[PDB]
Each structure stands twice: as structure tokens, then as C-alpha cells.
RNA sequence: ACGAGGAAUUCCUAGUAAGCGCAAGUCAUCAGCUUGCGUUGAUUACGUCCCUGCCCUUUGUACACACC
């Protein structure tokens, strides 16, 4: 059987990601769900959705949750994007060719945040994990890790190719640099959290948890261990809760001096940090009544090199800001928030003052939002397409354009359906207000208000579109007709408990009602003789559907499990269960028996309903799905959630002992060209100085791992173990015990690694001589008797030496516990 | 103290030991004896200290003492010519 | 006298006799202390 | 219809492989045989974990000495 793919992604305009900004009201990238979405915000209007060479869902793409993007990060002069997704992987973007060129991940869970080196052909990222690392742009290779926070990093600002700041989830200032590698300086920045710092040179503003921000002192000049960055004093904020983004704008010769700080409800302030000259005229003036108390209140200073003049605000939870000003006049500030809404604004200023108290709103990119949960879904005859959520506004899209045709706000709207001819929606809301609108004319029609006394949750035509049903919360099922421009209610239905989802047979047989008694009633509509009484799921059903020609519903609930019921009789075939929070909406192909379970787990599956297999499973959302629906003749399937994503499918080995011999030999041999070195060394120097040998060069191994030869056999000595050593250098010929001999000596020529070693080199040293005795004692060699004087002379300095240390401790310790037991036995 | 129980816990290998004797060394050499007795707690510390570095003086003396096959080599190659 | 645990719930005294303090040690080695514990107590 | 059985494969370590007979017919099995008993009686390993695997352990925890 065939398969479904996606289209794109469309309606999501704003997500959990920071925005920035390209000049030319410039350009403007934000992220979408897991690919980023190019503007300009003067059109007010995409010019491009940059993606991912992948299709979800499709014969090449893999079964997990798919990667959602969380940071933005642009380069213009090279015109590289830095972006960086929610596992942890890290892509670039040149923004013309729209091509991924690097593709790195070294990252954990997700990053955080990116920053480029101001072309440094560098990218450093820092995570949610305690990472920061460096990367190549390149090389396609890490520069290094940077790992001393506890938690999760939080904001982090370099400079040169030296120093770093960071700080993290705990509230711990650090500092980094690339020489010494490791962290330098640490502080307490504040007792919880610590979520955004800034600079320009010399000072250091952070945030904190509750309006306790602070200033700081940079020296990267001094050479004092404790205190390269020190603190000064707080200020507060008017929102108390936790900033979490602050950035500096400056220029030349106006003084732009002005940092924002995001708060974390609806609220950016903003502040300017002032010049000496007036620093300097107002010392004064605070120093007037003229030390101590003075020098006092003047530690008590943030006060005054601060100048809160601003505190912008937005019509609801912002997410994310960025910057653009223009001399002394103008300060223009781009802020994209919760919801898929943003909001560029600007201020007027003269250079001490605003003159305006509120800021103005000169943009406002409003067109493909949703502004809440959309959690309502039509589509007409493959004509268009629709959307509702609880903003009110509903909006009417199209297929190969998906603009938002239509939107008009209603209030909080949770179900909606067509007429049958398309061209008109029906819709009720959390009361028993019912709303019709039109696609083209006056978009009003009218509105039974007080339908019910309490909410409705479902509604449904008829086939012919003239009836409708509803089911309300207040325990009450009721029919509607229209008339030709308006409707007529004319049939109550008291029920014994609540429905909340009803469903009409599309070949108008009869319709299912829920209840949240955990049933469903099989009611006629002709004659509403309650057919069936069908349950088994001991948690309230809440979709219902029915099969095309009114034979098999699929009915489903907060159990997780779906249940196939035939008609015939309300038997069943299967209680199947699947998607492992709850399902909220199945919905069934117009002609066969296969049908779309969508969850609250962001994942549609479609299963054919004779042999009952999730015959696909489809990941491509975020969030959860709340709502989904097919279209009427195309196996053309739309699906909604609470990410604010609307989305279309459609048709398709060595042992021990030779370790050591080879290991021994090559030392031996380096050891021996550094010795005949030195010898033409004596030939240039300290000789008939005219030429020279140039220098036997590094044997590979040793200078890759950069050990010296004798510590290199060293290791390989230490790493084999006691039980099979004594065969492992039993192994080793003659000629091996001697080079082993010519290491002793090279070995103890260093007293660094010869005491640490010590009992290790004489059980072995005398194993091998005792060994090899008989050879020994006949070998002819005059430097080789020499050498073994000097093994034996050195070999036992060393050990009566320690001995020497060994005993001394001995008598002075027992001098102590017998004299004291001389005292006070 | 502090440094005599951590001391007294490294003194119980044969790798961390000499390290272990010579900081022994260095406490007992500088400071005052009569101190060091008076310092209440520390014959616990010290004789258990005591057999572990008489154990390891017996270690080192019996090392040594095989140390001279290197003398009885030398003796017979000189004996060879 | 043997090394036994350690005196203090701040650090860890291993039967080889050197310790660790539980603030002294990066986290990979807390995790691997942690796992070589858990099969040293699971035996 | 045949001149000692090919490709390869199976099995096998001491009174063992194998040759030679001879009895009996023991409630199931077997007389085309089965089981006993006697006789004659070797060659090659009797090591190794390298290959094929299979298993066990990774606190040594047992009470000195020693090693780890």
C-alpha cells in the first residue's frame, strides 16, 4: 500500500528560538519547527523557508521525534547561519545557495546558544549541558571542550582568541581562556539562577533570578589571581521575575550607550549607561552636604552610571528581542513572542529622554498566526482548508499558496465545520454560543447565543448539510436547521449524563454520542430509538467515528487504546492500544477502512482496520496534535497542534612479552640515534668543526603520543600485568636483555620516574639477570661491565636511600608511643 | 592530625607509601616531639603507622639484599679475564 | 588497623587506601564510582 | 560385473583402534542379529588456548608470609 509524505510546515511564524536580524527594518530570520524561516518585516511577509534536505515521514527518513530548531546565529559578511537544534547538533547555512556545509554535533541534549568569532572562522556553542566548545568552520572538527559548570550554561561572551565568560544555571560566573585552557576565575553571581550577561569592556552587567541585577569590573589587565573580575553593587528592576537576555548598542560620538534586559512576562526595560562628563558633574552633586558616610552612599553607584528610561511592553509573553538604532533620534527593536506573533517596534529619543512614554509599534507581523492552541480543523473540497483556535480568529487557507485567506475573531473556539458546498462555517464556542461566517461577504452572519447554558464540545452536519447536531456540556444533545441565512433550532435532547462528542453517519444513518460516563449511545436520527448503548473504557470517549458506508465506528478515549466496533450489533473486533499519553481525534479515509489516530504525543499513525497494524507512523510535530482531519476525495490529510503547526500528508592483537620486546627495541633504537647524535653534536661543537649529521628525526609513535622512549616502556611494562610477566620477559632473547640493560641505565640517568618505579624495575631487573645469569657472567663486553657498575652503584643509592628514610621513621615513630607511654602509661 | 590520618591511610600500599614516609619525614623532623605526644589522639594514629613502615622496612631490606647478584655477576666477570 | 569506609559521608576511602572527597571529583568520575559501588554492593 | 573405494566426511587416546574366534538367546530389543566371553594387539598426542567454540570471574576477602 502507498505511503504519505509531508508538504511543509505552515502557520508556524515564531517558535523557541531567538531571532536576528540582517540590515539592509531589514531582513529577519527567525526559526519555524526544526527550519527557519527568512523575512522582511516591512512586506510583512516570508521570502524564504530555509529547510532540511529530509522529508519526515517518507522511505528515507528514520523513526524518532525530529530535531526542533532552538538557536539562530548570523554571520553576514561570509553570510553563513549558524543554527543549532535541539539534540545537540550544530549546521551552517550559507543563505544564498540554501545548502548545509558543515554539519557538526558534539552536544548532548540541546544547545543553548551559538556564537560566531566575529570571522574568526570559528563557532563556539554552548549547551544545556555543562559544554562549551569551540569548532572549526573549516576543518569539520572540534577545537576543544570547555567543561567546568555544574548544570547548564546560560549566556557566555569571547573576545580575541584568549579570554571567554560564561555563566550557567548555578550561578557561577566563569572564565575561560585557550592557553592555560581551563577556567581561571570563578564567582557566585547570584543565589539561584544566573540567565544573561553583557559587556562592553570594562564593566559587566548580569541578570539574576528576582530583580537583583549587577554590576561588575573587568581587568583583564591585572595579574592577581583572586579578583581578575570583580563586582560593585545591584540595582533592580520593575518586573520581578528572572531576566534572560541582555545586549549593549553603542555608536560613535552620539554615545549610544543602551542595554536591554528581556524579563520573563510581557516586559523588555531598557537602560543607558552615561558618559564621564556627566559621571563627573554629578559626583558632585550627589556629593553635596560637604567622607565616610559619603564614600558609603557612593558604594550604594549603579544608581548613578545607570538611566532606566524605557520598559517596553508587549500585549503578552514575550520570547525574544533583537536590535537595530540609528544616531541619537531613533532606536528600533525587533521582539517575536510566545505565541507565532512579532512585534518590531520603535522610539523616539533625545539622547537623555524618550519624549514619549509609550513606545510605538512601526511593525506587526501578524498574517499566518494562531495566537493560542488551534484546536479545531475543516477542510472543504479540495478547495481550501481551515483553522480555529480559542484566539477567535479563524483562518481560511489555501493549498498551493497557504496564505491566510480570512480571519475574523469569534472567541474561544473549539469545534467547526463546513456546509457542504464549502463557502460557510459553522463553529460553537465555550458557552452555547454558536457563530456562522461566511468565506468572502460580511464575515459575521449570526450567532445563537445561549444554544446551551454550558459549553459545547461537538458538532456535526448532516450529509445534505440542513440538519445540524451539537452535543453540550450541560448534558444536552440539539438539532439545528438552516434557513434560507440563518438557523432554526427545533429539537431538544436531554440525555441521562454529559456528551462530549458526537458524531452523524455520513450516509446519515444515525449519529454516536459520547458521554464522559465512559459510553457511547448509538442513537437513531430518524427516530432516536437509542439503538446501542456501547462501552468498555472506563475513561471518557472522546473521539467518535464512523465508517462510509455505516457499518464500523472507531471510537477512542484518555485510555490510549482505540476500539473498532462493528455495527451489526456493537460487537467488537479490536482493543487496540497505542500513542502512550492519550488520543484525542481518529479520523477515517473516505473510502476504505483505514484510519488516523493523532495523540498528545506528537505522532499521527494510520492503521488499516482488518489486520489492524499502524501501517504508518508519523512523527513531524512537536507537541500535541489537537486536531486532525482528511480530505473528502484525496487521501489529503491536515493535522494542527499545540506548537502551533499545521501540516499536510499526502499520496504517494599482540600478547604480553612481544608487546614489550617491539616496544623495547624501537625505544632502544631511538635512544641509540639520540646517543650518536650527541657524538656528531661532539663532532660539530667539540671537534674539527666543518660539517655535521643533521639529526635523527622523532620516531613517529612516541613523538604522536609525545613521551619520551623510556617512559614509553615505561607504560608498556606498567600496563602488563604480574601473572604473566614472569613468561613475558622470560620470553625475550639475549640481545633483548641486553637493550633491556641499556634502559636501566637510560631509566636510572633520571631520578624523576626512577623512584616511582622502584620496586617494579628491581623485581624485574633481577628476575632477568637471575635468568640469564649464565650468559651474562660469559659475556665479553668492557661497557657493558662498566654499565652494570653503574646499575648496581646507582640502583643501590636508591634504595638505601628510601631504606635510610624507612628506618629513621621507624625508631622516630616508636621513640614517640614509648614516650609517651613514658608519661602517661 | 588531618594530614597524619590521610597519611596513615596512604601508608598501607606500596605505591603511595614512600611518599607517605617521607611527609612522615618531614612532620617528625620539624616539628616538636614533646608537641607531637601532647597532641591528643595520635598514638591511634601512630601505632598504626608503626608496623605497616616495618613491614615495608623489611620489603626494602630483603630487595636490597638480592640487589648484590649484580656484585656476584661483576665478581665472575672479572674472574672471566 | 585496616582502611575501612569512610568516616564522613563528604568523601569516599577505597580498601586500596586512597580516598576521594565527594566535592573534590569530576562528575564522570562520580558516575563511575557510583556504577563500580553498585556492582561492588549488587555481588 | 571387479585390481582396495575418489572428492571429502565421520569417529577415536591403553590392554584403546583393529584382526581372530567362541558360546548363550535371560519378561523390554535382537536372530539378516543382539549381548556376553576369550584370544592377538599397535601407531600418534598426553601439550596448547593460536584457530573453532563453550564456560567462569572481574572486591582475593581467606587467618598469617609474600604478591596484587
Redesign the interface.
Known sequence: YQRFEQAAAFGVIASNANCVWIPAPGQLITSALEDVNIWDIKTGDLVSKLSDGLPPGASDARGAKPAECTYLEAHKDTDLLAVGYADGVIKVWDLMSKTVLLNFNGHKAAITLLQFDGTGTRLISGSKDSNIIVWDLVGEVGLYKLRSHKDSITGFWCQGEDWLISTSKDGMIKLWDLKTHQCIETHIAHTGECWGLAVKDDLLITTGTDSQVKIWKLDIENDKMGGKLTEMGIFEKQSKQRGLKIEFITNSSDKTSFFYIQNADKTIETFRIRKEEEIARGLKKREKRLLTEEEIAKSIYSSFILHPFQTIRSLYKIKSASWTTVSSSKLELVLTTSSNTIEYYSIPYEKRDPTSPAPLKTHTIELQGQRTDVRSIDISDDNKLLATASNGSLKIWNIKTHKCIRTFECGYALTCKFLPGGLLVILGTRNGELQLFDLASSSLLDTIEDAHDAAIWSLDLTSDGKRLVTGSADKTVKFWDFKVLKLHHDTTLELTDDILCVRVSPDDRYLAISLLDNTVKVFFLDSMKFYLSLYGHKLPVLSIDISFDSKMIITSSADKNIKIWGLDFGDCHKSLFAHQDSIMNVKFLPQSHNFFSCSKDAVVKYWDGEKFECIQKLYAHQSEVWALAVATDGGFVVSSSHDHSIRIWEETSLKAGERLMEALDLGIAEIEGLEAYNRDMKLWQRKKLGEAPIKPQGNAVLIAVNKTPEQYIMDTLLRIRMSQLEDALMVMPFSYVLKFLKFIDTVMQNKTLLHSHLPLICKNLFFIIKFNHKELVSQKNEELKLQINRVKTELRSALKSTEDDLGFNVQGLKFVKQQWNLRHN | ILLMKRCRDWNTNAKTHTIAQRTIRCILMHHNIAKLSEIPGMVKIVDAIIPYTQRHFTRVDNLVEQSYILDYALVEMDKLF | ???GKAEKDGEI?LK????MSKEELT?EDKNRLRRALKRKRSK
Open positions: 588497623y585496616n582502611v576511602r586500596n587506601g586512597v580516598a562528575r
